[PDB]
């Protein structure tokens, strides 16, 4: 009602940007609250919420209101570097002043702002932000998008022993990454929505800084510095990724990650634009990739690899293979095959932390 605060432009940008990251008019506004030397900014879409806290040095008066998120961030971003932003509520209008720049913004009541219903935390732990970035980055691309099986439109976050694991799949390809966090955790597995995975990923630009994760039965929370990101969990049953992992992949191929990637990228040019099918013929220390399309054009690549198994032929969607080779970012890659109708496990030749399983196409 009588809300007032004066703060630097640089202390407001990232807090505003992260929170601002509509259907109902109030979802397009940010809830601002001043209380006990702290400005709290809150954004929400009803499924997830981002809360940012900014400490107030200069004099202030408590109160609360909601203001357009995008316009208020654009105002603060547009002001010169080092600017002092004086904010105050004047009736039903929030005034923003800085130098000789004055902005009168419209408001909606703070009482009308939606809040996520309270919950109790079951699992809790801390880890570096780079470990969480690596876990998400390594499996993000394998999540499904707008799949009828709603539980696949997200990432499985799983704790076991002293490891945090992320799993993502769309029924055709799967990605699993495990990282040790050095703390004894309970056996818990939850599905974070793909919108939440993106928001959680967009706020991890502090490398070794810590991140505290609190998981509940229907919610997950992430504390990065002065931010608090909370998201509802997907209420479904994730498939048993252990069942579909290749059991006995006897045939082992080893090749250069880049040379294999550039060969698949070149063969992909003349593959079917809708089905993206490539044929892999593997033989003693050799891999022949072939691609055909309805225009009767053909691409063919022969590479020197390390392979001592039996000769076999197998089909694959070249985009799924390239996505795995782009994600690995290593010197040498290992493909572990079984037969022409079973999946392949692709890993880095020097690391077992991240594994990828791709189901083939019938050739």
């Amino acid at each position: 009602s009588h809300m007032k605060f004066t703060v630097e432009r640089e202390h407001l940008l990232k807090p505003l940007q992260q929170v601002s990251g509509p259907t109902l008019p109030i979802l397009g506004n940010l809830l601002l609250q001043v209380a006990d030397g702290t400005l709290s900014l809150t954004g929400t879409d009803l499924e997830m919420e981002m809360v940012a806290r900014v400490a107030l040095v200069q004099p202030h008066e408590p109160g609360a209101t909601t203001v357009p998120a995008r316009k208020f961030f654009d105002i603060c971003r547009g002001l010169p570097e080092g600017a002092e932003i004086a904010v105050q509520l004047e009736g039903e209008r929030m005034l923003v002043r800085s130098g000789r720049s004055r902005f009168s913004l419209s408001t909606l009541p703070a009482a009308d702002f939606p809040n996520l219903d309270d919950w109790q935390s079951e699992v809790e732990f801390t880890l570096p932000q780079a470990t969480m970035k690596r876990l998400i980055e390594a499996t993000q691309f394998s999540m499904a998008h707008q799949d009828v099986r709603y539980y696949l439109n997200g990432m499985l976050f799983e704790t076991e022993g002293e490891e945090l694991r992320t799993v993502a799949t769309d029924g055709h390809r799967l990605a699993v990454c495990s990282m040790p966090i050095g703390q004894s955790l309970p056996s818990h597995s939850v599905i974070v929505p793909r919108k939440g995975v993106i928001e959680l990923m967009r706020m991890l630009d502090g490398g070794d800084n810590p991140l505290r994760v609190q998981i509940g039965s229907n919610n997950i929370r992430a504390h990065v510095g002065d931010f608090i990101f909370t998201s509802k969990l997907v209420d479904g049953r994730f498939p048993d990724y252990r069942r579909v992992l290749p059991k006995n992949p006897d045939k082992h191929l080893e090749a250069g990650c880049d040379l294999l990637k550039q060969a698949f990228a070149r063969a992909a040019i003349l593959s079917n634009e809708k089905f993206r099918g490539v044929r892999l013929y593997v033989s003693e220390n050799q891999l022949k990739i072939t691609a055909n399309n309805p225009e009767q054009e053909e691409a063919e690549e022969i590479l020197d690899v390390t392979y001592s198994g039996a000769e076999m032929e197998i089909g694959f969607n070249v985009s799924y293979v390239l996505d795995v080779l782009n994600a690995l970012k290593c010197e040498n890659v290992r493909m572990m095959l079984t037969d022409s109708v079973s999946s392949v496990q692709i890993e880095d030749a020097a690391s077992q932390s991240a594994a990828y399983v791709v189901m083939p196409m019938r050739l």
């Binding site: 799949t169 029924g171 055709h172 498939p239 069942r243 579909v244 399983v357 189901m359 196409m361």
Partner: peptide
């Protein structure tokens, strides 16, 4: 394309 399950 063959499904994993």
């Amino acid at each position: 394309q063959a499904x994993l399950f």
